[PDB]
Design a binder for these strands. Structure first.
Lengths: 89, 78, 100, 92, 97, 78, 89, 102
DNA sequence: CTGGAGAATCCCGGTGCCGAGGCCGCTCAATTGGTCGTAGACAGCTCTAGCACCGCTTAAACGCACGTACGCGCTGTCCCCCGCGTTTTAACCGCCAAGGGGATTACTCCCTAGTCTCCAGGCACGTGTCAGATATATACA
DNA sequence: TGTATATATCTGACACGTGCCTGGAGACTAGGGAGTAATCCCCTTGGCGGTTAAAACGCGGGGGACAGCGCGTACGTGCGTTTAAGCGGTGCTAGAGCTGTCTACGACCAATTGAGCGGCCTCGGCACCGGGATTCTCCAG
């Protein structure tokens, strides 16, 4: 179940808006969906250069494979800078 | 013959939902045909799942796996 | 959290737990679920922005998968993302052809 | 007039999200064709309605590709040959 | 005035190059097109030429998918003529547009 | 100008295997458009795989991986 | 590669027939392609029953999912035949 | 090899060893990939048998990928299994419709 | 129109090239003699879930008049892809150096799984109240 | 006939709130996954340099998709009617989860070994080719 983080970020973004349980299961199945998209593509991607360790460069490359253009630049932006802030700790 | 339980007015309302004005009688039994082909597909591979699973109650996650295999992603049931 | 190491909200250890038991490699670098949960938190952020703004702007208070339907079908990037994907309890967008 | 109220019905069923077909003969049709492999499986009724969900979603998608065929064939009267082109491009 | 009919000769040569197994376009402008478009994205690209041959192969095979698929589309529209609505239609039915 | 290097009567011969009697002139350029889209997708993701491999020399295994992932798998090249 | 194995079975079926190396790479590549097809289907279906182990029932299930018809059942006859012959020895 | 032990040709140790070395599951059952490669010699016998027959259909001894192309595309189960996947230098199934004929 | 001059294409017979086919060491990749904690099916039965009988009702569905609104056939279009032939340009064949890049020598580095704990983040598991469901009452096209 | 607008109470759903527990990290380790320094050779780059087949270009030709008209239908709307789906209420009924259970099964080490790997002749299958037999056919009746 993914009600925790979707609902809390939902409380961080839209305070005055409700939600059904149906769409919450849509969020759960959605994150499962694209999650397995990325895990599958990266899982193929590591062998392609004879690597067996799932690190972030494979993931960001896979993001460069998947998302078209603008939101890829935004995902590389906020995610890569999010990794940079993770390295600041 | 519960294929007639798929009623002709329901096919009319789905055809209007597709925006169809003049609906031939040819369209209804063709809908039964191609639709029922999809049905035989789904009951076929779904019963391959469940009979592979050796279980007697067909659950929702089975046809989640089935429509999942068909390139047909559905949300709201997982 | 390791999200509190990162300044984020998605669970690094739980998504990383799905990496560890998702059975893809024997040894896995821990740097991958940070960027993974980061990108999913960003994509989650704009898709929930479209959710709350889409359902909220239509004189509605609770997000229903109908508004997920015209929320995704009003989007082109989500069209790129959810092309082979069907939304339950969504119906269709109000899309009538000019010939209709 | 034959159709303006029907166009409002188009806006209703394109506005509504629930199903439209009688659910028990639908269920007995699922079990009926399902007896080809084992008779009287146990089902969730909502699972049967979810086969109706994705199934009629494919149907409405076929009404949209058939619809674009009718736009392409300059007509409002859908034909089985329109379904021949639509299924043909879908490979059926 | 050694002439033929206006129209049957195209049909026979259609019968040949449908009946036969070969490509139709050049090699070097394709290869310099691989270099040409490819310089736009990262400098100093060195190219296996057989990869370029394979990409021309899969290119024209995808073109067979194109003109045969939209061929059947124009056939449905009571036409021997390809129109842009054949292309944009059929690729929309593919889900590409 | 090698998008024009794929010549117009070559596209006509692609209608000869394509089986077209009457060829509109706009079909050539839109065909170059879809061609450009298809190609730039392929070399785009292919050079993404190339930049992950820390390379400067593009191999065929790139478009093996991409055309696998593009659902138009090709054989005879490893 | 697997060129020699296709070569041996080729000479089992058609001794009086040559083969080109390009077609050899076509069908060797095809064999490897279907090899990851069953490997992926066996992976997801292995995840479905949540087993650590894939047996001939899961593989047989995967083929009977993917392969359309009676010729697949004859492949069940050949595979069950040779494996079942190979079992007790 | 265990292939000739099982009455096969296709390599058991290479393929089953790939079944450990492919990142799919924890434990790799013994009877599964021999059953699998048995289906491979089945389908190999299918397409290779059609390839020899079609290569004889143009009275040739050595198989070109053309006969693979119209080998798959003329079979219902092969073309249904291979409607999306393209082979190299195979060519096109000849198909004349009514739009060419008078 | 049927019925032929001339191309289309198959065929009948060279040749000679190296592509597949076969030939020769030699492993290195597959195979196994042996251990080693164990992963998965059935034993037993639930309780919840799911099918089934009892019994009343209604927009849905089926049956029917009618008057339509649309599918398409006949003729007309001109322009436009194709037919004939032409003319060039860069494609194509064959050629030279080169340094880049992939491979190859280990090198050499820190990292990424294994273990116990921990202990609060998080997950089972209930109420309420208010947006909305559904009226409750009100004015207009 | 469809629409919009304050009024009213009822529902249950999702937010809230309580009780239990679990899930991922902290430190530490170990040897090895994977970059790295060197670095070499051969091969792909980027040209030369002769060849010629490609494709473009012009000049019309008669007929393609559409269009105008028009015939001639097949069905959507309305309407009567009843009705099986709906509903709902309960009764009957078994199916996957839970606990165990009990041992097999793929790792694990190393030893073996011989099949294919790398590589090298090589025979004739075939790849144009000169030239002929035959069918198809564009333009004549």
């Amino acid at each position: 179940s993914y009600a925790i983080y979707v609902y809390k970020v939902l409380k961080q973004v839209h305070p005055d808006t409700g939600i059904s349980s149906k769409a919450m299961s849509i969020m759960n199945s959605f994150v499962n969906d694209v999650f397995e998209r990325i895990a599958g593509e990266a899982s193929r991607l590591a062998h392609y250069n004879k690597r067996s360790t799932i690190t972030s460069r494979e993931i960001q490359t896979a993001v460069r494979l998947l998302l078209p253009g603008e939101l890829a630049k935004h995902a590389v932006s906020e995610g890569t800078k999010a990794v940079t802030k993770y390295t600041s700790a | 013959d519960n294929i007639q339980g798929i009623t002709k007015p329901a096919i009319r309302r789905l055809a209007r939902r597709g925006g169809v004005k003049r609906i031939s009688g040819l369209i209804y039994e063709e809908t039964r045909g191609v639709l029922k082909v999809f049905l035989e597909n789904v009951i076929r591979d779904a019963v391959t799942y469940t009979e592979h699973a050796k279980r007697k109650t067909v659950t929702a996650m089975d046809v989640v796996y089935a429509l999942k295999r068909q390139g047909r992603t559905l949300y709201g049931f997982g | 959290t390791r999200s509190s190491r990162a300044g984020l909200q998605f669970p690094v250890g739980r998504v990383h737990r799905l990496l560890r038991k998702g059975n893809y490699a024997e040894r896995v670098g821990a740097g991958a679920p940070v960027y993974l949960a980061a990108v999913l938190e960003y994509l989650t952020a704009e898709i929930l922005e479209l959710a709350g703004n889409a359902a909220r702007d239509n004189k509605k208070t609770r997000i229903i998968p109908r508004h997920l339907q015209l929320a995704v079908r009003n989007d082109e990037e989500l069209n790129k993302l959810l092309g082979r994907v069907t939304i339950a309890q969504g119906g269709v967008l109000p899309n009538i052809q000019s010939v209709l | 007039r034959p159709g303006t109220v029907a166009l409002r019905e188009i806006r209703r069923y394109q506005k509504s999200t629930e199903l439209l077909i009688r659910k028990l003969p639908f269920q007995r049709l699922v079990r009926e064709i399902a007896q080809d492999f084992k008779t009287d499986l146990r089902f969730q009724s909502s699972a049967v309605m979810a086969l109706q969900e994705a199934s009629e979603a494919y149907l409405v998608a076929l009404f949209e590709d058939t619809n674009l065929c009718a736009i392409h064939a300059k007509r409002v009267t859908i034909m089985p040959k329109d379904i021949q082109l639509a299924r043909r491009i879908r490979g059926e």
